[PDB]
């Protein structure tokens, strides 16, 4: 319910080492391609201002009662520890999102690529040699700064403890109001005037500071931290068939970091949400109806991985039996894909095995390659400031990056519950699937800039029903399979997997003997992960990747589709409740032969508060459009003749360059339409003197064309012929900006034409 509103009072720069065009440093831009303040900048800046306040109240003691309060509100900084610390680090109470421009302004920008650039401008910078007083070699830069007057707002959450006394709540509000009001600058080059701001909380004012001034001498130590322990009841019913399957649709509302591994200083991201990330939301929503912790221990609950939505369904990890033509084929090309479980390699052409991504649905007469889904991802780079030097240093790491899944991606998980647990719930709440709609935070760095997702529940889907083919059994690993060897460590082998299914299904299996057809296509997997409840990393989990495939000829017995269905629900192996072990039997995408197939803004309201700021952006986009178009129109001698009548005839210029220069000097005085008296006065006095009027004979009507261009207010815009619709966002913006920029457009076009004329005259001269 809280917001931070930031009013930027000078031009501001944030966020990126990269630089794009002729600019050396470029600002951070959100998913709408509009500049914004990252939530980690906002937290780090606000923390720093609260740290100054607390440092004052402690009478400068760098540790003390009030620095305890900062560590209470903003969480401890491990990696600043100077001695033995026995308690685990506290997380923050305050989560602060990224600050974005006004949503109604952001809608107006959509698609208007030229306007999104105009929000910023180049700021030059030079460094000067102290003895000579001239610019140093190398020391030149041009920097993007966003226009001042941007007003940005961030969501804030204070998830205070369930027991904090009202005296302590007033202290927390006091500090945050105090630190906000002490905050004056953010971003790059603060010390040189960039990034001045007003930062205000909703509902905190000087009353919050004044209470603290009146009472700080009375304040105690913060309360001790306590974990939210689990609590079981043991009261669940026995699991009974059927299994209900409830699809959960996840949509990313901000970037999500889902750590695959760290290489160097960059955290890499998964391209799916593991089911373990959703258990916290399942605990939040259903733990009131049944003992969720017992259901996990009994295995009465499965939450699958969320994989990218394709064909309205969860995308399925690309089977490693598919091979693409190495030259120009594969699912990324949409042709030249062979199912090596069934097709020989073609002669000559070598193939590359498929290695990732997700495929949509496929049916046993698809006539097309299955729809292939891709997950977009972005790299976010951050720093850590050492507080005394106020710059990053090696002692605090200082640079790191997260890959993240960007916003707007949609994923589908499925919660599976036995019939007996749905009965438990429905006896207590008939609408319980309505309680599954939520917005939650998942991932690394979940408390600020990253991790915000919508969850929406669908209607109960049908149980999968595989075909019970007695000729071959084929297994697609839709998720990572973790098996334990007979020593209970994870060093199992594909022969342990044969026995597992052989024992589970009551059938004997043997590898298919066809020499051209591969029978097994696995890759090994290792997962390294923390466990937050333990405060220690999980034991390392080893297994096979999703997408791994194998196919067995059934030696004896008969496979029962009833049991294949049940395994497709509950999965196989370790930790199936997190969606490990999810598997697909006899899916026709493994059975088919594929080599032949191929693939299938609105304006701001006039009353809107940001209308004054939008007007600054529009003029910038219009000015650059006019300047660019004036350059193009001067480049061609037919257009200079159309517009002003000027022409080149052999070596001669019509009129002389001196006559153009004389006119141009008068046009410099055309600041406004009401100065058009000045320019028309010049032309009549010229036209009245016979020797001067005839200087402009042999021009194409040049004196009337100039008279028209200056006195007909529509005419400049018809010669420029710019489509201003992509360059305007204010309602009635076009007519206003035309009246404002008219005189400047006339000056710009005449200036361009005379320059272009002279530098073509030089060519005819120099022949």
Write out the binding residues for another protein, residues 683-712 only, by CB under 8 A: 685, 691
Q: Which does 553 bind (CB under 5 to 8 A by kind): another protein, Mg ion, none?
A: none
CB 548 within 8 A of CB 436: no
Residue nearest to Mg ion (CB): 24
Report the alpha-carbon distance of residue 314 to residue 458 in Å, rounded.
Answer: 13
| Least distance (Å) between residue 727 CB and Mg ion | 24
Question: Which C-beta is closer to Mg ion: that of 136 or that of 465?
Answer: 136
Stretch 416-455 residues interacting with another protein (CB under 8 A): none
CB 90 within 8 A of CB 535: no
**181 near another protein, judged by CB under 8 A:** yes
**Of 449, 446, 425, 445, nearest in space to 436 by CA:** 425
Token representation of residue 752: 């361009």
Q: Which does 59 bind (CB under 5 to 8 A by kind): Mg ion, another protein, none?
A: another protein
Question: Which C-beta is closer to another protein: that of 53 or that of 643?
Answer: 53
Q: Is the peptide bond before 242 cis (omega within 30 degrees of 0)?
A: yes
Question: Which C-beta is closer to Mg ion: that of 599 or that of 685?
Answer: 685
Q: Where are the alpha helices (DSSP H) in 143-251?
A: 166-182, 206-215
**Of 307, 302, 269, 315, nearest in space to 411 by CA:** 307
Token representation of residue 686: 């010229």
Q: Which residue from 18, 85, 135, 632 is in contact with another protein, where contact means CB under 8 A?
A: 135
Question: Which C-beta is closer to Mg ion: that of 512 or that of 664?
Answer: 664
Q: Which does 520 bind (CB under 5 to 8 A by kind): Mg ion, another protein, none?
A: none
**Of 230, 256, 223, nearest in space to 90 by CA:** 223
Phi-psi region of 443 (alpha: psi -120 to 50; beta: other; left: phi over 0): left
Contact mark string toward another protein, 602..621, x via CB under 8 A: --------------x--x--
Question: Which C-beta is closer to another protein: that of 386 or that of 420?
Answer: 386
The helix (H) or strand (E) run that includes residue 420 is helix 419-428
Stretch 634-673 residues interacting with another protein (CB under 8 A): 662, 665-666, 668
* Other Cβ atoms within 10 Å of 258 Cβ, number: 23
| Least distance (Å) between residue 703 CB and Mg ion | 17
- SS3 at position 461: strand
| Least distance (Å) between residue 739 CB and another protein | 17
| Least distance (Å) between residue 261 CB and another protein | 32
Stretch 705-744 residues interacting with another protein (CB under 8 A): 744
Applying CB under 8 A, what is the total number of residues that bind another protein? 72
Report the alpha-carbon distance of residue 195 to residue 6 in Å, rounded.
Answer: 11
C-alpha triplet 136, 139, 141: angle, nearest 5°: 145
Residue 260 backbone dihedrals phi, psi, to 5 degrees: -80, -55
Segment near another protein (CB under 8 A), from 272-280, 472-480, 512-520, 748-756? 748-756
Q: Which residue from 16, 64, 91, 121 is in contact with another protein, where contact means CB under 8 A?
A: 121
Segment near another protein (CB under 8 A), from 436-444, 519-527, 544-552, 747-755? 747-755
Q: Which residue from 103, 111, 132, 767 is in contact with another protein, where contact means CB under 8 A?
A: 132
Report the alpha-carbon distance of residue 714 to residue 710 in Å, rounded.
Answer: 10
Q: Which residue from 103, 137, 365, 427 is in contact with another protein, where contact means CB under 8 A?
A: 137
- In order of 125, 133, 200, 431, the CA distances from 130 in angstroms are 16, 5, 42, 75
| Least distance (Å) between residue 659 CB and Mg ion | 15
| Least distance (Å) between residue 571 CB and another protein | 51
Q: Is the peptide bond before 479 cis (omega within 30 degrees of 0)?
A: no
Question: Which C-beta is closer to another protein: that of 171 or that of 209?
Answer: 209
Residues contacting residue 18 through CB under 8 Å, at least 6 positions apart: 26
| Least distance (Å) between residue 382 CB and Mg ion | 24
Stretch 8-27 residues interacting with another protein (CB under 8 A): 10-11
Stretch 344-403 residues interacting with another protein (CB under 8 A): 386-391, 393
| Least distance (Å) between residue 92 CB and another protein | 17
The helix (H) or strand (E) run that includes residue 414 is strand 410-418
Q: Which does 53 bind (CB under 5 to 8 A by kind): another protein, Mg ion, none?
A: another protein
Question: Which C-beta is closer to another protein: that of 387 or that of 419?
Answer: 387
Q: Which does 11 bind (CB under 5 to 8 A by kind): Mg ion, another protein, none?
A: another protein
Contact mark string toward another protein, 141..160, x via CB under 8 A: -x--xxxxx-----------
Q: Where are the alpha helices (DSSP H) in 602-675?
A: 611-634, 637-644, 657-667
Residues contacting residue 358 through CB under 8 Å, at least 6 positions apart: 307, 308, 310, 315, 316, 317, 318, 372, 373, 375
Stretch 289-318 residues interacting with another protein (CB under 8 A): none
Segment near another protein (CB under 8 A), from 209-217, 399-407, 438-446, 709-717? 209-217
| Least distance (Å) between residue 412 CB and another protein | 44
* Other Cβ atoms within 10 Å of 163 Cβ, number: 8
CA dihedral defined by 137, 139, 140, 142, rounded to 10 degrees?
160
CB 34 within 8 A of CB 610: no
**196 near another protein, judged by CB under 8 A:** yes
Report the alpha-carbon distance of residue 42 to residue 655 in Å, rounded.
Answer: 61
Is 419 labelled as part of a ligand binding site? no
Token representation of residue 655: 């009129």
Beta strand ranges found along 212-274 (DSSP E)? 243-252, 259-263, 266-269
Q: Which does 135 bind (CB under 5 to 8 A by kind): Mg ion, another protein, none?
A: another protein
Stretch 533-572 residues interacting with another protein (CB under 8 A): none
In the beta sheet, which residues pair with residue 653? 648
Report the alpha-carbon distance of residue 269 to residue 296 in Å, rounded.
Answer: 26
**67 near another protein, judged by CB under 8 A:** no
Report the alpha-carbon distance of residue 592 to residue 663 in Å, rounded.
Answer: 79
| Least distance (Å) between residue 743 CB and another protein | 11
Question: Which C-beta is closer to another protein: that of 132 or that of 459?
Answer: 132
Question: Which C-beta is closer to another protein: that of 131 or that of 638?
Answer: 131
Question: Which C-beta is closer to another protein: that of 213 or that of 533?
Answer: 213
Q: Which residue from 55, 164, 648, 715 is in contact with another protein, where contact means CB under 8 A?
A: 55
Q: Which does 138 bind (CB under 5 to 8 A by kind): another protein, Mg ion, none?
A: Mg ion
Q: Which does 24 bind (CB under 5 to 8 A by kind): Mg ion, another protein, none?
A: Mg ion
Q: Which does 141 bind (CB under 5 to 8 A by kind): Mg ion, another protein, none?
A: Mg ion
Question: Which C-beta is closer to another protein: that of 139 or that of 530?
Answer: 139
Q: Which residues of 382-402 are buried (b: 16+ CB within 10 A; e: fewer)?
A: bebeeeeeeeeeeebeeeeeb
Residues contacting residue 41 through CB under 8 Å, at least 6 positions apart: 14, 15, 186, 187
Report the alpha-carbon distance of residue 712 to residue 103 in Å, rounded.
Answer: 40
Q: Which residues bind Mg ion (CB under 5 A)?
A: 24, 138, 141
Is 32 labelled as part of a ligand binding site? no
Q: Which residue from 751, 758, 760, 764 is in contact with another protein, where contact means CB under 8 A?
A: 751
Q: Which residue from 53, 105, 322, 551 is in contact with another protein, where contact means CB under 8 A?
A: 53
Q: Which does 401 bind (CB under 5 to 8 A by kind): Mg ion, another protein, none?
A: none
What's the per-residue H, E or C state across 370-386? CCEECCCEEEEEEECEE
| Least distance (Å) between residue 36 CB and another protein | 16
Residues forming the annotated binding site for Mg(2+)? 24, 138
Residues annotated as binding site? Answer: 24, 138
């Amino acid at each position: 319910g809280i917001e931070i509103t930031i009013t930027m009072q000078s031009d501001w720069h944030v966020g990126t080492g990269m630089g794009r065009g002729e600019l050396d440093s470029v600002v951070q831009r959100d998913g709408d391609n509009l500049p914004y303040i990252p939530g980690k900048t906002l937290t780090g800046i606000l923390r720093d201002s609260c740290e100054q306040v607390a440092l004052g109240l402690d009478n400068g003691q760098t540790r003390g009662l009030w620095h305890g309060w900062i560590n209470f509100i903003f969480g401890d900084q491990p990696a600043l520890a100077q001695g033995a610390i026995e308690p685990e680090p506290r997380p923050a109470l305050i989560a602060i999102g990224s600050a974005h421009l006004d949503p109604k302004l952001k809608a107006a920008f959509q698609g208007k690529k030229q306007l999104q650039e105009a929000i910023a401008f180049m700021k030059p910078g030079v460094a000067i040699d102290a003895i000579t007083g001239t610019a140093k070699k190398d020391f030149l830069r041009f920097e993007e700064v966003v226009r001042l007057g941007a007003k940005l707002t961030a969501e804030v959450e204070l998830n205070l403890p369930d027991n904090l006394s009202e005296t302590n709540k007033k202290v927390i509000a006091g500090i945050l109001a105090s630190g906000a009001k002490l905050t004056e600058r953010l971003g790059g080059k603060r010390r040189r005037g960039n990034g001045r701001c007003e930062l205000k909380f909703s509902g905190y004012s000087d009353q919050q500071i004044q209470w603290l001034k009146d009472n700080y001498q009375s304040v105690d130590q913060p309360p001790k931290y306590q974990q939210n322990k689990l609590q079981s009841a043991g009261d669940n019913p026995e699991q009974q068939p059927p299994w209900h399957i409830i699809p959960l649709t996840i949509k990313t509302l901000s970037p999500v970091v889902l750590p695959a591994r760290t290489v160097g200083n960059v955290v890499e991201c998964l391209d799916y949400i593991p089911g373990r990330y959703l258990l916290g939301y399942i605990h939040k929503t259903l733990g009131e109806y049944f003992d969720v912790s017992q259901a996990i221990a009994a295995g009465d609950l499965i939450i699958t991985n969320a994989t990218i939505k394709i064909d309205g369904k969860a995308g399925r990890a690309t089977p490693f039996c598919l091979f693409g033509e190495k030259l120009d084929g594969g699912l990324g090309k949409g042709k030249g894909v062979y199912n090596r479980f069934q097709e020989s390699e073609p002669d000559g052409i070598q193939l590359k095995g498929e290695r990732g991504g997700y495929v949509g649905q496929f049916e046993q007469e698809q006539r097309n390659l299955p729809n292939t889904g891709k997950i977009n991802s972005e790299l976010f780079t951050h720093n850590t400031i050492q507080d005394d030097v106020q710059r990053p240093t090696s002692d605090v790491g200082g640079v790191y990056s997260y890959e993240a899944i960007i916003a707007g991606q949609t994923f589908v998980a499925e919660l599976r519950l036995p019939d007996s647990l749905v009965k438990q719930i429905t006896s207590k709440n008939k609408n319980w699937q309505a309680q599954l709609k939520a917005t939650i935070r998942i991932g690394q760095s979940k408390k600020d800039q990253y991790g915000k997702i919508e969850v929406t529940s669908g209607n109960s889907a049908d149980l999968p029903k595989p075909t019970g083919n007695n000729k071959t059994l084929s297994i697609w690993f839709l998720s990572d399979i973790l098996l334990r060897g007979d020593r209970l460590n994870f060093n199992a082998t594909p022969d342990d997997l044969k026995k597992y299914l052989e024992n589970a299904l009551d059938i004997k299996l043997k590898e298919r003997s066809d020499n051209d057809l591969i029978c097994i296509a696995l890759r090994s997997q290792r997962t390294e992960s923390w466990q937050v409840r333990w405060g220690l990393p999980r034991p390392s989990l080893v297994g096979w990747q999703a997408g791994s495939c194998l196919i067995y000829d059934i030696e004896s017995g008969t496979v029962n589709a009833e049991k294949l269905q049940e395994l497709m629900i509950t999965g196989i192996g370790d930790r199936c409740t997190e969606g490990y072990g999810q598997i697909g039997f006899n899916d026709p995408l493994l059975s088919a032969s594929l080599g032949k197939l191929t693939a299938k803004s609105n304006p701001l309201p006039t009353n809107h508060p940001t209308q004054d700021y939008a007007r600054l952006i529009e003029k910038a986009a219009w000015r650059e459009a006019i300047q660019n178009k004036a350059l193009a129109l001067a480049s061609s001698r037919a257009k200079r003749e159309e517009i002003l009548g000027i022409k080149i005839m052999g070596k001669d210029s019509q009129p002389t360059m001196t006559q153009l220069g004389g006119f141009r000097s008068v046009l410099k005085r055309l600041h406004s339409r009401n100065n058009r008296d000045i320019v028309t006065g010049y032309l009549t006095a010229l036209e009245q003197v016979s020797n001067r009027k005839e200087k402009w004979s042999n021009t194409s009507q040049g004196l009337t064309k100039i008279r028209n261009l200056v006195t007909q207010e529509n005419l400049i815009w018809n010669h420029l012929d710019i489509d201003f619709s992509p360059l305007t966002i204010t309602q009635n913006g076009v007519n206003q900006l035309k009246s404002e920029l008219w005189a400047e457009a006339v000056r710009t076009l005449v200036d361009a034409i005379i320059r272009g004329h002279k530098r073509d005259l030089e060519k005819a001269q120099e022949n």
